[PDB]
Design a protein around this ligand. Sequence first.
Ligand code: HEM
Ligand SMILES: O=C1C=C(O)C(=O)c2ccccc21
Ligand SMILES: O=C1C=C(O)C(=O)c2ccccc21
Length: 404
Amino acid sequence: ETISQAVPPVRDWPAVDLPGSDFDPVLTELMREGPVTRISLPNGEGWAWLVTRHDDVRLVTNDPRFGREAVMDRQVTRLAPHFIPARGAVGFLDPPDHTRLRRSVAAAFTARGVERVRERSRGMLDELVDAMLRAGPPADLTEAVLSPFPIAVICELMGVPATDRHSMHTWTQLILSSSHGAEVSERAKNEMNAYFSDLIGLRSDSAGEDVTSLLGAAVGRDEITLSEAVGLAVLLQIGGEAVTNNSGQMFHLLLSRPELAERLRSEPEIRPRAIDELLRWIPHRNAVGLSRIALEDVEIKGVRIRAGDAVYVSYLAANRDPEVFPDPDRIDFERSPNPHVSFGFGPHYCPGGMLARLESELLVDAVLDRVPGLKLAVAPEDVPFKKGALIRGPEALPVTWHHA
Ligand code: HEM
Ligand SMILES: O=C1C=C(O)C(=O)c2ccccc21
Ligand SMILES: O=C1C=C(O)C(=O)c2ccccc21
């Protein structure tokens, strides 16, 4: 042989505030380099591998050779200045115990299960929209509806009293407050852990359809421990708010490209498919989330991922796979196979996938059908987006409509 340098150089991938829904140029680069790359994020230590292809992302995330529990044994390079989920949360559990914990609340998150809160949710959404209209045109869609709605729906499903909604949002906010290197988020986590630990105990260990009752009944029959239950209850509540940000990009885009909004207004039946196309395209987060550790050597596209090596997958990059999604950057409401991985893949796939689809469904409906001539009150570029955050999205969405 000769002089083989088949190992990709560690690419520095600093935290950078992107505008609107533009694609990360660095991620663009990582994708062109090769199937397997190496990156260095703002925090933690080391380099961790990076997979971007649709097929390799499905492999890594659904293969027993890559685990999550081991990820805590080291300070894997990352984007967030501290691990959000505790040492017992779903995100860090592997198939054996992970499957058990997720089964306890499965019934509430399937299409049929979520379909049970459709009417209830529709009514809540309608009150918020009615309130927006009554107030008057110059409105911030995020504060007026995209923020309150998802919060009300998850709390309702979880069994959280409507009077405690403000607290969930405050805690979620602080917990995801992203950076420094300490306990504003830690205290916030203990407070919310304490909140759900008590709710799970407060007779919610008897009978009821809400998730906390399911978790309480499960804890009562030794199916899952209280730690696992609180850990899951906490991440569901938090993930619940992920819709605000995603739907924010959805609307910023629909009103940004009038031809997309018009197709949805004049052709309602295609809304489901369009929403899935929008979910595939929308760059939901910054960089990547929680890595996996190779539990044993594994060869991928010529690269040897040594046991002990951290591996990252980019669902955003995967949803932009040319071979799987021809003309990737184009938002086509038709799109044939469209097997996007915006909700993850493998055992850790998002349990809120169907709920979010339902929420997105009602939002598009209510917003496009009840607000005549809804449009941005400012130029697309003048809309501010979240800075230094994990999940990308509008900070506010100024819009106006016919009325005034
Ligand atoms: C359209 C909005 C949403 C998007 C794009 C999204 C996306 C994701 C992604 C990419 C993951 C990680 C998969 C992995 O680790 O491989 C995840 C995990 C998770 N999501 Fe979501 N999510 C959304 C909404 C929600 C909602 C509303 C909830 C609350 C019911 C939720 C709860 C969770 C939980 C609990 C996990 C951790 C699952 C586990 O590790 O077992 N998500 N989500
Ligand atoms: O919205 C998410 C995006 C991720 O990449 C992600 O890893 C995640 C994990 C847990 C809840 C939500 C999310
Ligand atoms: O990006 C994320 C990474 C996590 O580990 C995580 O737990 C999370 C939860 C909710 C929204 C985003 C995230």
